[PDB]
């Protein structure tokens with residue numbers, strides 16, 4: 001499978017994906033990295049790996065559908081099979097999500113369905129859980145609500161900040177996100193017709 005990775009920042013997940021797709025017997029190759037923001041570290045990581053990049057600035061579009069169509073155009077250019085959202089911070093419109101249904105994965109830093117949203121760590125700490133984690137899911141229109149592929153539990157330490165917890169969870173992210181990409185790329189895991197996850 002030919003893979004795009006969309007990012008908005010650092011790109012530590014991008015890196016784990018790159019390294020994993022270059023292990024032998026990988027069912028995936030990363031062919032393009034798209035950022036909605038210029039001068040983010042993820043872009044340099046992609047270029048250092050020999051992978052082409054684009055910056056599609058979301059602020060230069062009147063609405064989400066137009067921004068999403070610009071992404072889609074690039075995805076076709078590189079005939080992409082699967083899209084991974086790796087720190088991508090833009091909510092995608094209905095038609096884009098529908099088009100990529102069963103073919104687009106996201107990494108979220110909580111054990112869904114707890115702590116949906118971009119500030120999951122802040123929520124985990126506020127709530128006072130001793131166990132949080134991360135989730136790879138198919139992307140549905142409803143944010144952080146698509147079908148769960150893999151999850152990994154991560155302890156919260158008394159006195160954790162958002163920074164310390166975030167770093168501990170990213171270590172788990174870097175395990176399950178490549179694993180889940182291989183599962184979907186190999187056809188081992190699919191979004192079944194009934195809208196439910198299916199393992200072959």
Ligand SMILES: NC1NC(=O)[C@H](CCC[C@@H](c2ccc(C(=O)N[C@@H](CCC(=O)O)C(=O)O)cc2)C(O)(O)C(F)(F)F)[C@H](N)N1
Pocket residue numbers: 085087088089090091092093094097106107108109116117118119139140141142143144145146
């Ligand atoms: N329709 C659709 N459905 C999805 O399930 C997607 C996956 C969402 C991933 C996450 C997510 C949840 C909320 C936002 C959000 O509010 N975006 C704002 C921009 C906010 C900002 O600039 O901080 C905006 O206006 O776009 C950004 C990301 C996440 O909480 O899991 C995390 F960790 F990535 F942040 C998707 N992109 N589109």
Ligand SMILES: NCC(=O)N[C@@H]1O[C@H](COP(=O)([O-])[O-])[C@H](O)[C@H]1O
Pocket residue numbers: 007008009010011012013014042085086087088089106107108109170173
């Ligand atoms: N679209 C999914 C994405 O928002 N996931 C979350 O954003 C951060 C990105 O870090 P990173 O740029 O070092 O991979 C977190 O690593 C991840 O949980």
